[PDB]
Amino acid sequence: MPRVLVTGALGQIGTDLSLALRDKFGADSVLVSDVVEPGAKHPLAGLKGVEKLDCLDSNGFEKLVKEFKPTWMYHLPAIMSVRGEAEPDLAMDINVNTTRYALELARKYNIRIFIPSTIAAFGDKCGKTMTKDDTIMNPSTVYGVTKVYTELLGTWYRQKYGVDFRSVRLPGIISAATLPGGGATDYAIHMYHSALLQKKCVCPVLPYESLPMMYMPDTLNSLVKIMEAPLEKLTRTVYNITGFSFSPSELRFSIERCTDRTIEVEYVEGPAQKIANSWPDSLDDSNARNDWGHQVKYDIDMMSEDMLRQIPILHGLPSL
Amino acid sequence: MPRVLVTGALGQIGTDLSLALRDKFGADSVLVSDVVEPGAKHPLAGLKGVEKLDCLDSNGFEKLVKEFKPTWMYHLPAIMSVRGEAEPDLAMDINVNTTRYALELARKYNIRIFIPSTIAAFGDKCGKTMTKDDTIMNPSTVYGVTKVYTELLGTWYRQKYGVDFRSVRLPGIISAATLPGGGATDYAIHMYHSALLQKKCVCPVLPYESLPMMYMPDTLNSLVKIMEAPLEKLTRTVYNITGFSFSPSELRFSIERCTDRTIEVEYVEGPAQKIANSWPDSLDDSNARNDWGHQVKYDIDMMSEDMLRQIPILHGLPSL
Numbered sequence: 001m002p003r004v005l006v007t008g009a010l011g012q013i014g015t016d017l018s019l020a021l022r023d024k025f026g027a028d029s030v031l032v033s034d035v036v037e038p039g040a041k042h043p044l045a046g047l048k049g050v051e052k053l054d055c056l057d058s059n060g061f062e063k064l065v066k067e068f069k070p071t072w073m074y075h076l077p078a079i080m081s082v083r084g085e086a087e088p089d090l091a092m093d094i095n096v097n098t099t100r101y102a103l104e105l106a107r108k109y110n111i112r113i114f115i116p117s118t119i120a121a122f123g124d125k126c127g128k129t130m131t132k133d134d135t136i137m138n139p140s141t142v143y144g145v146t147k148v149y150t151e152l153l154g155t156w157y158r159q160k161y162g163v164d165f166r167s168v169r170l171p172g173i174i175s176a177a178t179l180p181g182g183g184a185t186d187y188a189i190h191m192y193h194s195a196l197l198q199k200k201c202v203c204p205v206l207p208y209e210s211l212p213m214m215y216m217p218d219t220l221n222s223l224v225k226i227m228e229a230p231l232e233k234l235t236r237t238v239y240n241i242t243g244f245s246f247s248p249s250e251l252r253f254s255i256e257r258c259t260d261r262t263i264e265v266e267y268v269e270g271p272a273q274k275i276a277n278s279w280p281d282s283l284d285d286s287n288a289r290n291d292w293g294h295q296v297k298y299d300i301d302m303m304s305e306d307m308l309r310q311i312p313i314l315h316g317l318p319s320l
Numbered sequence: 321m322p323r324v325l326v327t328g329a330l331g332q333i334g335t336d337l338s339l340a341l342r343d344k345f346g347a348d349s350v351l352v353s354d355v356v357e358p359g360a361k362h363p364l365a366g367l368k369g370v371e372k373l374d375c376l377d378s379n380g381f382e383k384l385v386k387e388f389k390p391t392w393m394y395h396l397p398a399i400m401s402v403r404g405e406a407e408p409d410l411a412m413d414i415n416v417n418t419t420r421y422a423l424e425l426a427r428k429y430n431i432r433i434f435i436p437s438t439i440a441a442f443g444d445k446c447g448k449t450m451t452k453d454d455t456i457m458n459p460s461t462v463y464g465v466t467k468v469y470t471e472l473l474g475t476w477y478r479q480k481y482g483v484d485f486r487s488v489r490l491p492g493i494i495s496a497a498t499l500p501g502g503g504a505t506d507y508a509i510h511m512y513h514s515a516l517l518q519k520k521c522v523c524p525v526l527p528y529e530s531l532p533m534m535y536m537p538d539t540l541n542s543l544v545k546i547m548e549a550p551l552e553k554l555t556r557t558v559y560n561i562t563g564f565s566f567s568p569s570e571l572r573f574s575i576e577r578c579t580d581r582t583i584e585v586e587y588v589e590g591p592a593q594k595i596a597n598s599w600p601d602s603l604d605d606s607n608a609r610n611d612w613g614h615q616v617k618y619d620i621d622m623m624s625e626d627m628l629r630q631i632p633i634l635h636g637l638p639s640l
């Protein structure tokens with residue numbers, strides 16, 4: 001049974017991943033950390049093994065690793081696509097420097113290390129229909145740039161020092177628990193909240209812009225699964241994974257089918273649209289499926305039913 | 321007429337580029353900077369317009385730019401392939417951080433900025449014959465990883481802010497002006513010296529490993545030409561350029577054909593071997609030819625004749 005460190009743990013992915021790890025391996029085997037402390041209403045508030053650590057503080061990062069002696073690490077902090085275009089110096093600092101520290105710690109302390117990539121590592125030359133694992137990578141966002149740097153550096157660590165670096169290119173992730181941190185796919189979660197609150201939703205992505213997406217329970221399954229795989233079954237360090245693709249107009253229809261209630265949606269093209277337009281419409285994830293058994297249970301309507309149930313319970317929005 | 325700033329200017333490229341720029345534009349038009357001073361025998365020793373600057377010092381780099389007001393910048397400092405693998409923290413510091421500051425300055429002060437990339441930005445999935453401008457980039461060295469980041473970040477600056485960022489992927493560059501160090505293609509400059517000295521050459525590169533390469537006067541021509549082009553002529557930010565390809569054993573036959581003597585080469589194992597083996601055999605530079613008139617005069621024998629004439633004149637080794 002592994003000892004697992006999650007850094008950047010209080011955000012969208014980290015909140016549910018931390019709970020799932022704890023459930024599967026037991027709380028004593030999981031330590032999580034974030035630059036901020038949890039609010040009283042955060043799901044990880046009041047739990048043991050939840051620490052304050054700025055990953056840019058490389059001494060504090062080493063101390064924590066040396067004390068806990070993880071065998072696995074999920075290194076999650078990054079400034080994402082939309083927010084990075086508005087805060088590019090913070091993105092370059094966090095996404096490049098915390099990654100370099102994390103990899104050197106994986107090398108020095110023998111850790112299997114996962115650092116997520118993203119569909120934002122692609123740009124407009126990738127071949128946007130059923131995008132392959134190996135293709136031209138020309139990101140149009142600083143976030144995307146720093147994620148291609150992530151993939152390549154991690155792979156270099158694997159080749160040069162035998163560091164067990166693993167990654168997936170995550171699609172937009174949908175969940176109910178913790179609000180998203182500023183990607184171009186944040187509209188999808190907000191659309192649900194707009195429908196439940198009966199407020200107008202202003203969508204900055206255009207109505208027919210299809211993107212690869214996935215619901216959180218499939219994501220968690222894959223994040224765990226890729227880490228448990230024997231190193232011999234892996235043919236590459238970085239895998240595309242997807243759940244299913246959708247556009248905003250498709251998601252809106254899914255939500256109105258479940259609520260029996262028109263959502264009001266004004267498309268008013270923001271930063272997210274130009275960014276999303278440079279990304280894949282869909283991904284080919286045959287390598288992940290073949291090598292380590294990436295699998296998806298949820299479709300768009302299963303997800304929307306679950307989302308529409310969870311959000312009122314978790315956030316006290318109105319129900320139905 | 322431009323006001324040109326060259327950073328990392330005392331090296332192999334910088335030394336001869338700085339001379340060519342001062343000839344073409346006038347010494348008062350050109351400012352050369354480096355983190356070291358020129359040695360007593362350096363071609364730039366004693367001249368005006370030679371400043372000392374550590375480009376890792378963001379504030380001092382901004383001061384120099386404020387004071388001189390360049391319209392063009394050639395940003396040249398980097399840790400290259402063999403030294404990068406031995407000192408990767410230095411490479412990641414220099415190659416990423418100085419590049420970020422350079423681009424920021426080009427943004428803030430309206431500078432046309434050239435930062436070279438390299439054939440080391442490619443790895444074994446590039447398509448090693450006549451490698452294309454847009455292909456899979458999977459570099460096998462930390463240097464190479466940092467240069468993909470350089471290309472992508474530079475390009476983002478161009479897209480996001482309209483910075484007039486220009487780059488070529490330089491092949492192995494051969495010149496007489498500087499003494500052969502321990503770099504990966506530095507074997508070729510070593511062989512010339514051994515031929516003149518009638519010593520044996522110790523070559524870590526496999527005998528038949530073809531690499532793209534170029535002789536300096538062609539390099540100088542293209543480095544100036546790409547910066548003179550109107551922006552409207554450029555269809556891209558990063559171009560392949562090559563001179564011609566050769567292997568160590570081709571270089572030896574060339575040197576033999578010129579000197580009418582047998583020269584001695586011992587092929588050994590060394591870090592350069594595996595690095596070189598991961599790089600392209602030849603490059604397609606048709607974009608660079610068509611857009612801005614990249615042109616190559618020299619072939620191997622013309623270079624060998626010249627090198628065998630120049631090294632004795634500049635370094636005072638035995639001639640003929």
Ligand SMILES: NC(=O)c1ccc[n+]([C@@H]2O[C@H](COP(=O)([O-])OP(=O)(O)OC[C@H]3O[C@@H](n4cnc5c(N)ncnc54)[C@H](O)[C@@H]3O)[C@@H](O)[C@H]2O)c1
Pocket residue numbers: 007008009010011012013014033034035036053054055056075076077078079080094098116117118119169170171172173174179180181182183185
């Ligand atoms: N959510 C998505 O749809 C999506 C898609 C693709 C890739 N990803 C990647 O997954 C990762 C996690 O994303 P997420 O959505 O949970 O993001 P998030 O923004 O919701 O969470 C980021 C967490 O990192 C923490 N953090 C920020 N800077 C830190 C620092 N210096 N030190 C320590 N912690 C720091 C933040 O406080 C936050 O709790 C990132 O690498 C992101 O690129 C997410």
Ligand SMILES: NC(=O)c1ccc[n+]([C@@H]2O[C@H](COP(=O)([O-])OP(=O)(O)OC[C@H]3O[C@@H](n4cnc5c(N)ncnc54)[C@H](O)[C@@H]3O)[C@@H](O)[C@H]2O)c1
Pocket residue numbers: 327328329330331332333334353354355356373374375376395396397398399400414418436437438439489490491492493494505
């Ligand atoms: N020479 C080649 O065959 C070749 C091939 C491909 C690409 N390039 C690229 O050309 C550029 C220069 O290559 P070169 O061969 O002249 O290198 P070089 O190593 O001969 O010279 C580099 C110079 O940079 C200086 N420098 C190092 N750190 C610095 C700092 N912090 N601040 C300011 N200056 C610093 C060094 O003192 C040295 O004078 C690099 O970007 C290299 O990647 C070179």
